[PDB]
């Protein structure tokens, strides 16, 4: 705040504290600590020449120092940071974008009694966790599906059409007739019979004369709306109709939840208070469309193999063109190895972990050539089924959904050759200004096709069916714990109660598509190489996309 | 469908027993044989029998032509053509082997008389002794066209001080062991019926795999053979988490 005076005379704070006290402690603010007072002596002594008898200068300085403490939350006591806020003041006279992993995402529970979300303190911050702090507790296993049921039932009960209403199952134990609307998990009992389950209880289900609503998938492990008649001669709910819970747009969903900063980039929330913000959204929507079409981030075709030579040559040819106009973000996705890497008892050949390391060293050679792409592009690394830690147990199969990033030990100098590189979990959330994008990599179509209810009674239609099921169920894993185990405390990562604005859903078993639904956009990159053709697609935050091919 | 010039036939082969797949239902297994070129062609179109509704599994898509021939014919293959004298026609084009094939006895493979060479790295039937077979093969494209017996001793290490004597000692034994290498290779090959160059010395599980697979093919049992994959090929059900398997 100004310079060029004679020299910084040194004076003791005793002759400075009365003015600061009257301006701060009396009127607005308080707690000028002794160390903070000594800190506030240097900057006022920088322009000390002909002052303490002057006019506005000191008062305006104290006013400006108060401005930070009204703006930032800070606290009460003034400490050695007092110079740190004046650095911010002189600062005053893209950004705000992040990539959130599964582990670093904030946790929020839901109270059905209160219709509201309650914060959960993270165990990493306060718990010691020096030896075992990531491990969940058994109580989460008991509430894992109860949390899903509560979220879906709230949405079902707030729909416009419903006001027959959904009845708890145990309310059917004495009735011999009438109709009921039951909502619950569809599964198989330990006896092998199809059944429906809600927190109240369970009931067996008869499909012998069921007429389902075509247009979506009926896989065990998902919420289903059902209608029929209950017979007390046995215990059977004879079904006459079957559907899935309706979906809800995020604009109508946000108002119910207020303005909670779930993926909070505005700020953070703790056990004391939560954060909301509305006025900034309009101006940042303005900035999103303020002639920023130059931003360009690219998702490559999934499942690219580094060990193969033709794939590496095709990637070099693709980066040749990417060098010309550097993408804003470049997301390398899919399994980076063509074979699962396991303990490899045979040591006659070179170890598979060392081979994994070596295959990540050729990337440095191929990438160091293109200096501009290093200089002004950020790369996002998505894991796959055959990466290091998972394949040590699953041996190439698909297991736990929250998949940890690639270890930093076997990939070390790719952080040097490239400028911005971030490793991310299998499900991740890119927060770009007023936009949330979800990155997910698995084969969904095969598992849907294999597991269907099969009621006793052009290929792009399957894509619409998959999109509708995934979006209406509001969850990325419409499956029981048997088909796919889930980390108990990380399940909130996989629940889409607010529908994401943009979705990255790659499946090698499903053809590429571009669909729109209730307030979102779903794109499907897949099969990096196909029919001797290497494909990769571009997407722009202004909701336009392009497909670029290089044999 | 009749659209494909293949041969399909209902079969009763004995399937493997995955713990998850337990329901008997019915039996309508098929034995579709179809050349791989039109199979690649059929990969393109959407509508085809291999990709349609109600498909439970493909059970032997992993086996390569190389493995099929090394398991069916073996080292001692002979020509039973007869018919028209297409020996010249067979040699100018590619001899199709499905129609005409026979495996003669291999009791004495070779009375060896041939020149042998070396090629070694320490980071005509030539013998390749290198830590990285693929890298050396790719760097010199001319190396592919010549026959090589690939024996790999890997992971050279150094004490970092006075390494010249230890390099000399490591070179001496590899120089002098040529007579032993070829002799042991022929000794294994004469019983194995696998060709000499395909077979490796340290590789011992490969012999068991080929013998067990062909004596299984003598029976009607399905191979479940899977290549460079730690899990069996059960038709795709092996790509899902199961409690009993875990």
From Swiss-Prot, chain A:
Listed GO MF terms: DNA binding
Q: Which keywords does this Swiss-Prot/TrEMBL entry list?
A: Cell cycle, Cytoplasm, DNA replication, DNA-binding, Nucleus, Phosphoprotein
UniProt GO BP: DNA-templated DNA replication; DNA-templated DNA replication maintenance of fidelity; error-prone translesion synthesis
Processing after translation: Phosphorylated in a cell cycle dependent manner during late G1 phase. Phosphorylation may facilitate the interaction with POL2 or the activity of DNA polymerase II. Phosphorylation is independent of DNA replication but dependent upon CDC28 in vivo.
Q: Which residues carry this modification: Phosphoserine?
A: 477
Q: Which GO terms describe its cellular component?
A: cytoplasm; epsilon DNA polymerase complex; nuclear replication fork; nucleus
Pfam families named in the record: DNA_pol_E_B
List the subcellular locations: Cytoplasm; Nucleus
Extra information: Present with 3110 +/- 251 molecules/cell in log phase SD medium. In eukaryotes there are five DNA polymerases: alpha, beta, gamma, delta, and epsilon which are responsible for different reactions of DNA synthesis.
How it assembles, according to the record, is: DNA polymerase epsilon is a heterotetramer consisting of POL2, DPB2, DPB3 and DPB4.
> What is the documented function of this protein?
As accessory component of the DNA polymerase epsilon complex participates in chromosomal DNA replication. It is required during synthesis of the leading and lagging DNA strands at the replication fork and binds at/or near replication origins and moves along DNA with the replication fork. It has 3'-5' proofreading exonuclease activity that correct errors arising during DNA replication. It is also involved in DNA synthesis during DNA repair.
Concerning its family, UniProt says: Belongs to the DNA polymerase epsilon subunit B family.
Protein name listed in UniProt: DNA polymerase epsilon subunit B
Query: What organism, scientifically named, is this protein from?
Result: Saccharomyces cerevisiae (strain ATCC 204508 / S288c) (Baker's yeast)
Organism phylogeny? Eukaryota, Fungi, Dikarya, Ascomycota, Saccharomycotina
Gene for this chain: DPB2
Swiss-Prot record, chain B:
Location in the cell = Nucleus
- Name the source's superkingdom: Eukaryota
Describe its assembly.
Answer: DNA polymerase epsilon is a heterotetramer consisting of POL2, DPB2, DPB3 and DPB4.
Q: Its function?
A: Catalytic component of the DNA polymerase epsilon complex which participates in chromosomal DNA replication. Required during synthesis of the leading DNA strands at the replication fork, binds at/or near replication origins and moves along DNA with the replication fork. Has 3'-5' proofreading exonuclease activity that corrects errors arising during DNA replication.
Family, per the entry? Belongs to the DNA polymerase type-B family.
**What else is on record for this protein?**
In eukaryotes there are five DNA polymerases: alpha, beta, gamma, delta, and epsilon which are responsible for different reactions of DNA synthesis.
* Protein name (record): DNA polymerase epsilon catalytic subunit A
Q: Which organism is it from?
A: Saccharomyces cerevisiae (strain ATCC 204508 / S288c) (Baker's yeast)
> Which gene holds the coding sequence for this protein?
POL2
Q: Which residues of the full protein are shown?
A: 1369 to 1710 of 2222
């Amino acid at each position: 705040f100004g310079s060029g005076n004679v020299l910084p005379v040194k004076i003791q704070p005793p002759l400075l504290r009365p003015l600061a006290y009257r301006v701060l402690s009396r009127k607005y603010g308080l707690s000028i600590k002794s160390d903070g007072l000594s800190a506030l002596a240097e900057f006022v002594g920088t322009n000390i020449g002909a002052n303490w008898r002057q006019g506005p200068a000191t008062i305006k300085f104290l006013e400006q120092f108060a401005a930070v403490w009204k703006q930032q939350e800070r606290g009460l006591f003034i400490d050695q940071s007092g110079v740190k806020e004046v650095i911010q003041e002189m600062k005053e006279r893209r950004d705000y974008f992040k990539v959130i992993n599964a582990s670093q995402q904030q946790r929020f529970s839901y109270n059905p009694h209160k219709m509201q979300f309650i914060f959960v303190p993270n165990k990493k911050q306060n718990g010691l966790g020096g030896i075992a702090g990531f491990l969940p507790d058994i109580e989460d296993k008991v509430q894992m599906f109860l949390t899903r049921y509560y979220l879906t039932n709230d949405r079902v009960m707030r729909n416009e059409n419903f006001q027959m209403s959904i009845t708890p199952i145990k309310n059917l134990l004495g009735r011999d007739a009438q109709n009921f609307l039951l909502l619950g998990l569809l599964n198989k009992n330990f006896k092998g019979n199809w059944s429906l389950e809600d927190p109240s209880g369970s009931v067996e289900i008869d499909i012998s004369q069921t007429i389902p609503t075509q247009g979506h998938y009926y896989v065990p492990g998902c919420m289903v709306l059902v209608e029929g008649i209950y017979y007390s001669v046995g215990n059977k709910f004879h079904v006459t109709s079957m559907t899935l819970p309706p979906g809800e747009r995020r604009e109508i969903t946000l108002e119910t939840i207020g303005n909670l900063d779930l993926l909070g980039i505005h700020g953070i929330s703790n056990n004391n208070f939560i954060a909301r913000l509305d006025k900034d959204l309009k101006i940042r929507l303005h900035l999103l469309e303020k002639e920023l079409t130059d931003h360009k981030f690219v998702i490559l075709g999934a499942n690219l193999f580094l060990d193969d030579l033709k794939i590496m040559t095709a990637l070099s040819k693709i980066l040749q063109k990417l060098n010309d106009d550097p993408p804003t973000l470049l997301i390398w996705q899919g399994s980076f190895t063509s074979v699962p890497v396991f303990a490899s008892m045979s040591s006659r050949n070179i170890s598979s972990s060392t081979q994994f390391k070596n295959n990540f060293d050729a990337l440095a050679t191929l990438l160091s050539r293109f200096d501009n792409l290093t200089e002004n592009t950020t790369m996002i690394f998505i894991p796959g089924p055959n990466d290091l830690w998972g394949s040590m147990v699953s041996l190439g199969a698909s297991g736990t959904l929250p998949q940890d990033p690639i270890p930093s030990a076997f990939t070390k100098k790719i952080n040097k050759v490239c400028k911005n590189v971030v490793w991310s979990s299998n499900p991740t959330r890119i927060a770009y200004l007023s936009q949330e994008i979800v990155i997910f990599r698995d084969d969904l179509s095969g598992r849907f096709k294999r597991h269907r209810l099969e009621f006793p009674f052009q290929k792009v239609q399957e894509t619409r069916k998959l999109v509708k099921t995934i979006l209406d169920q509001g969850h990325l894993s419409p499956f029981l714990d048997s088909l796919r185990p889930i980390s108990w405390d990380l399940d909130h990562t996989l629940t889409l109660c607010p529908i994401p604005s943009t979705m990255v859903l790659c499946d090698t078993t499903s053809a590429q598509f571009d669909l729109t639904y209730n307030g979102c956009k779903v794109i499907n990159p897949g099969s990096f190489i196909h029919n001797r053709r290497a494909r990769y697609m571009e997407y722009v935050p202004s909701s336009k996309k392009t497909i670029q091919e290089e044999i | 469908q009749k659209i494909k010039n293949c041969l399909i036939e209902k079969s009763s082969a004995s399937l493997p027993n995955n713990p998850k797949t337990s329901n008997p239902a019915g039996g309508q297994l098929f034995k579709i044989t179809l050349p791989e070129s039109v199979f690649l062609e059929e990969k393109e179109n959407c509508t085809s029998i291999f990709n349609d509704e109600n498909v439970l599994g493909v059970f032997e898509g992993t086996i390569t032509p190389h493995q099929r021939a090394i398991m069916d014919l073996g080292a001692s293959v002979t020509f039973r053509s007869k018919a028209m004298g297409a020996l010249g026609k067979g040699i100018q084009q590619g001899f199709e082997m499905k129609d005409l094939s026979m495996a003669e006895n291999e009791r004495y493979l070779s009375g060896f008389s041939m020149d042998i060479g070396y090629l070694l790295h320490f980071p005509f039937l030539l013998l390749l002794q290198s830590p990285f077979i693929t890298k050396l093969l790719g760097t010199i494209r001319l190396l592919n066209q010549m026959p090589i017996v690939k024996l790999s001793l890997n992971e050279v290490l150094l004490p970092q001080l006075n390494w010249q004597p230890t390099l000399l000692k490591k070179l001496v034994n590899h120089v002098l062991s040529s007579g032993s290498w070829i002799s042991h290779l022929i000794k294994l090959s004469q019983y194995s019926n696998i060709p000499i160059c395909n077979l490796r010395l340290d590789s011992m599980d490969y012999i068991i795999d080929v013998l067990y697979a062909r004596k299984l093919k003598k029976e009607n049992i399905v191979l479940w053979w899977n290549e460079k994959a730690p899990l069996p090929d059960h038709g795709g059900i092996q790509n899902d988490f199961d409690l009993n398997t875990s």
